[PDB]
């Protein structure tokens, strides 16, 4: 009892108070305002190096989420520098990991490898098994991204890819499987799911489609266990993709159908449209062009709804070729015009030249 002293509360704004406000704003999802309050706490400064380390790291993570990777690099670099000088090698490893992921997005893979390697080595030295696993997952992600950054991906007919890409993807497989081994031993079902998903997509890019199916089937089972409908839908989509490349189009259609089922229940119009587009291409492979037109039209309508102009042109080109395979030359000419119009409007120089070469031929019959 004695609350007639509050002119002393009127001065303030403590290093800690600004920081806590920044964190609450990021918790609510407004990281743009959170950054201002974090940098304000930086201006005030503090004596407590443990607090300062936390501020730098959450500023890096906040800038990372706001796609300002340059300043994300700045503050994670400061966190690493601070952790190194006072010897919190526990802090050093975690900062190296965040610095690595930042470098991974910027495309500086060579330094990204080193930083996450530093995270792995320190975790193994301290016998930090959860940190070791997270390092393995990070390394897998970096090599997965490195392999993907060269890809105009070609398993086409019988295709070859550069040795650099195969080596990077195989390295990702090794890291993911090492992560999986340690995560299964720790009994972390969530991390097991994430590992199976990325392992499956890496095999998918490599051309190891049977192994991809197996991994995504495990992702599906874990997604059901957690009731994560979003993850369930991703597994269904990846499974459909893999069965396409195996040549079993009937099986693929039923997996894409299950993606559509969950998309309609989540009322996700964007995923619903992508599902219809995949179904349209599946029935094109099955040469049932009537069903292909049905799904490509459903995709077109959702695209026009969401004003997705890019996807509109994709539907027009597909519809043109579906109608051409049936013989409707008047309906084909209609969508080929719409393909030319959209391709001009969005700057698709490739599409514009194709739509011209399509109308020239179509006009003659």
């Amino acid at each position: 009892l004695g609350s007639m002293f509050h002119v002393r509360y009127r001065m303030e704004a403590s290093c800690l108070e600004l920081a806590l406000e920044g964190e609450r704003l990021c918790k609510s999802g407004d990281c743009r305002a959170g950054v201002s309050f974090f940098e304000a706490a930086v201006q005030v400064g503090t004596e407590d190096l443990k607090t300062l380390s936390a501020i730098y790291s959450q500023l890096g993570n906040a800038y990372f989420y706001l796609h300002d990777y340059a300043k994300a690099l700045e503050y994670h670099h400061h966190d690493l520098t601070l952790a190194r000088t006072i010897g919190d090698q526990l802090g050093e490893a975690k900062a190296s990991g965040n610095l690595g992921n930042t470098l991974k997005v910027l495309g500086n893979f060579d330094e990204a490898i080193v930083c996450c390697q530093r995270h792995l080595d320190i975790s193994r030295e301290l016998n930090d098994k959860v940190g070791e696993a997270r390092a393995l997952y990070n390394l897998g992600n970096v090599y997965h991204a490195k392999g993907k950054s060269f890809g105009c991906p070609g398993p086409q007919d019988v295709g070859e890819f550069p040795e650099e890409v195969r080596d990077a993807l195989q390295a990702a497989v090794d890291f993911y499987e090492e992560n999986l081994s340690l995560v299964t031993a720790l009994g972390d079902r969530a991390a097991q799911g994430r590992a199976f998903g990325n392992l499956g997509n890496t095999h998918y890019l490599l051309g190891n489609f049977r192994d991809a199916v197996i991994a995504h089937e495990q992702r599906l089972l874990i997604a059901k266990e957690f009731g994560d409908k979003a993850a369930e839908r991703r597994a269904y989509s990846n499974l459909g993709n893999a069965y396409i490349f195996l040549g079993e189009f009937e099986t693929a259609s039923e997996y894409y159908k299950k993606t559509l089922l969950l998309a309609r229940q989540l009322k996700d119009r964007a995923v619903e449209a992508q599902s219809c587009y995949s179904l349209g291409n599946t029935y094109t492979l099955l040469q049932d062009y009537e069903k292909a037109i049905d799904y490509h039209l459903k995709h077109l309508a959702i695209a026009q709804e969401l004003n997705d102009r890019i996807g509109e042109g994709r539907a027009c080109w597909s519809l043109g070729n579906a109608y051409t395979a049936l013989g409707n030359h008047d309906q084909a000419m209609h969508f080929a015009e719409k393909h030319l119009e959209i391709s001009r409007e969005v700057g698709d120089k490739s599409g514009e030249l194709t739509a011209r070469l399509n109308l020239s031929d179509l006009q003659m019959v």
Binding site: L16, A19, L20, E23, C26, K27, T51, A54, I55, S57, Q58, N61, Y65, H144, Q156, D157, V158, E160, P162, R194, G197, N198, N201, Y204, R234, S237, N238, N241, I244, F245, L246, G247, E248, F249, Y277, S278, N281, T284, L285
Partner: protein, 45 residues
């Protein structure tokens, strides 16, 4: 300089000489960037 393949710094090139050959497919969608970190500061001594 000696380097038959080191010139690959030049924009896009290089030649090398059930089932589904050709015709188009799509993309694939990976796994979530997991940010659990919005409560590292809040615990303090």
């Amino acid at each position: 300089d000696y380097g038959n393949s080191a010139l690959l710094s030049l924009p896009g090139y290089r030649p090398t000489t059930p089932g589904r050959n050709s015709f188009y497919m799509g993309t694939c969608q990976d796994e979530p960037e997991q940010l659990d970190d919005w409560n590292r500061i809040a615990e303090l001594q």
